Amino acid sequence: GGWNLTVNNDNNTVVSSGGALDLSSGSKNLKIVKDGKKNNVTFDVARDLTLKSIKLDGVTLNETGLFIANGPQITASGINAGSQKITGVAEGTDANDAVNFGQLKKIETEVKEQ
Amino acid sequence: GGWNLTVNNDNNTVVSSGGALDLSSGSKNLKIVKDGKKNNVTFDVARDLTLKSIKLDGVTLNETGLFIANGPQITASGINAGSQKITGVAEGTDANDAVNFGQLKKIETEVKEQ
Amino acid sequence: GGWNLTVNNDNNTVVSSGGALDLSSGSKNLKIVKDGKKNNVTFDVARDLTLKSIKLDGVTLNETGLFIANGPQITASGINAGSQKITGVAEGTDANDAVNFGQLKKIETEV
């Protein structure tokens, strides 16, 4: 006595009378806490994770960046707007700011009589 | 010789002498592996997760996209700049590249003579 | 009793005959479920997480936004395109839409 342990319905491993079982974490992403006074074990996910990828339906975040299926991609090579409009853009003020359509139309109306 | 098991201080049950306990993963997001050679069970977070949402204070990543609270968002429908400028934009040269303000100013300038 | 329980090979205690062991989660981010009176326990990551940060090599997601090392960032201050082109922009039609180079060239040609 002697109880049987299974994991994911694998085979019995006996934990015998006077025997032992060790529970361990594979990485810093999973915390397992126990002390020497009580049997109690607490498991948790780290609040700062290190991951290879995350899938959220058509949204993927990975080591290269953010990808949305049939949508934008954001990587170290830059922003791909996904063949979609970019909306909510404040007017550009510096040479290296994006311009919005209101700015383009102002210059169009000027150039036609300037 | 039995022993009593609770999970989150609940669902109290006896694991009797000769009885059995299974520990399983609810999904691919959490890996659990037994090594019966040394009576160890290792637990870890998968490095590739499938999730519904992540909240980091005002930042949300979910199945629709990336959201900054009251600010920019990136979804399949496109990028919303949040009524802020888009900075650090290089000059467009292909049809679907964004235009920066320096390009608009160059065209405004070149039509002085013409 | 009894059998010996360690975590990461440390903190041994004896789960004695007639003793008790509790397995609990430390936060809402980890789900541990016992199947009632059944001796099976399931562990999983919550599908909705609350985190401080995630690092994926040079990509960081945190409470400020999304950052790519040597690349763009997206925060409450706005989007920085990383001193690089923005590609794949559909033509703007409303006042606050971005405009693409084809639109700029169209107006250059018209004059």
Author numbering:
A (entry chain A), B (entry chain C): 385 to 498
C (entry chain B): 385 to 495
Please share excerpts from the published article on this structure.
In Proteobacteria, colonization of the host depends on a wide range of adhesive surface molecules, among which Trimeric Autotransporter Adhesins (TAAs) represent a major class. All TAAs follow a head-stalk-anchor architecture in the direction from amino- to carboxy-terminus of the protein. The head, which is projected above the cell surface by the stalk, mediates a range of molecular interactions such as autoagglutination and attachment to host tissue, typically via proteins of the extracellular matrix, e.g. collagen, fibronectin, or laminin. Of the experimentally studied TAAs, Bartonella henselae BadA is the longest representative, at over 3000 residues, and extends approx. 240 nm from the bacterial cell surface.
We have determined the structure of two domains from the head of the Bartonella henselae adhesin BadA. To this end, we built full-atom models for each domain, as described in the Methods section. Molecular replacement searches returned two solutions, which were further refined, and a trimeric model of residues 385 to 498 of BadA could be built into the electron density map (underlined in Figure 2A). The termini of the construct were not resolved, as expected from the results of proteolytic digestion, which suggested that they are unstructured. The overall structure of the construct is rod-like, with a length of 10 nm and an approximate diameter of 2.5 nm. The three chains are tightly intertwined and each can only assume its structure in the context of the other two. The structure consists of four distinct elements, as anticipated from the sequence analysis: the Trp-ring domain, named for the peculiar arrangement of the highly conserved Trp residues, the GIN domain, a neck sequence, and a short segment of the coiled-coil stalk of BadA. The Trp-ring domain forms a β-prism of interleaved, five-stranded β-meanders parallel to the trimer axis. The GIN domain (residues 435–466) also forms a β-prism of 5-stranded β-meanders, albeit not interleaved and perpendicular to the trimer axis. The neck sequence serves as a connector, which makes the transition from the wide diameter of the β-prisms to the narrower diameter of the coiled-coil stalk. In our construct, we had included 50 residues from the N-terminal part of the BadA stalk, but only two heptads are visible in the structure, the rest being disordered.
